[PDB]
Amino acid sequence: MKTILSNQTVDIPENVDITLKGRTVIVKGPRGTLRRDFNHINVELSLLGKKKKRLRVDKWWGNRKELATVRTICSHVQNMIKGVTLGFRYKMRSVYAHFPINVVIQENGSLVEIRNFLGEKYIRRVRMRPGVACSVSQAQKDELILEGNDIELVSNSAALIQQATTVKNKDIRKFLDGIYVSEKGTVQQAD
Amino acid sequence: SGRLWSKAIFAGYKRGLRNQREHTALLKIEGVYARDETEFYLGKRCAYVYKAKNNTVTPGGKPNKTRVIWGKVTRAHGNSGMVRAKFRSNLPAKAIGHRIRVMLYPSRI
């Protein structure tokens, strides 16, 4: 109905320091820096507060779809602030039947190489994203932990793993085999 | 020295979709882009200037290749400043897109 100035309130904590040059948002923190490009969205961005770092995201007029849009900027800035403080950690227990699944990290944490996968001979070489590391975790049977900063890149990597492990031409209510995302969380605990 | 005539481009004939009316012409005339603007140019004269390989003139000095068809502005035409015109002999229709001089003849200030 052509509303007016919907506004979302994004708190910023004390450790991170934000800086924007337009609709391009650049965030710095302890665990690296980060940036995104919100160019195609056409929403007023502004920050207020001497060292309190309140951010307001403001869209005027619009439609109902664009009032739906104005919250998505708030949620992505929230996820970037969670990432640049803590970083995201995905814990994946590999669920295997009578056949084991061997998982190695081939080069420098980037490449993941999956083997033996229901007795298939085909070695499955999967290339992860830039800016994310992967490690076989300790003290747990075949748990695989992906750690990174940008949650889109990390979860795209997890989706690439779980769609690399996909059973063809069978029942998928039986043959429940694959590498699935079991837990989403932070790098540094208790935060 | 210097140009005294204003520049105008012959755009076509007064016409319907199917049939034409060849006893009248239209002129898109540069610098004019409004019905209110094409009021100064009423009553002015227009001249078409061309070449021919025979050698015939008027008191402009000596025989030339140059021939000229005269005429004058009747009325405005549409909103876009285009101007109807009537000449003494009708156009050759070779001149669609060739410049017709609009002279500062009958000035009425």
Binding site: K2, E44, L45, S46 | -
Partner: protein
Amino acid sequence: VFRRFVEVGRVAYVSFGPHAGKLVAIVDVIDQNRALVDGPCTQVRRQAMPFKCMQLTDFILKFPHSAHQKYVRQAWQKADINTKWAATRWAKKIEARERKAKMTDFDRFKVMKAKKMRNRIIKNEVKKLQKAALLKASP
């Protein structure tokens, strides 16, 4: 961003329509697309005009919401909008455009002689200064 948004009591310029060149003050917004404007001293009577008609500028006033012509005139005279309006570069631009439209031939003759004299002085002193810049960067 968006330094100048409309308000109850923000002055406005009227670009295209029956009131070209005349300031108005915005009384109140009717619905999104037109608004009631009013001019006490700039000779324009209280009426509703669209937003794409009007051109916004930066002076504000202090009105009650939907006041009368009287209180609009009081705040107008107490804020001195007209003299402060003529003393900005915007109105200088409008004044120059009107003078250029209202030139004559003798005025254009004087403009071209002064234009030639200025551009010759510019050309000489620019050529001398860039030659001096070359002579400065030469050691």
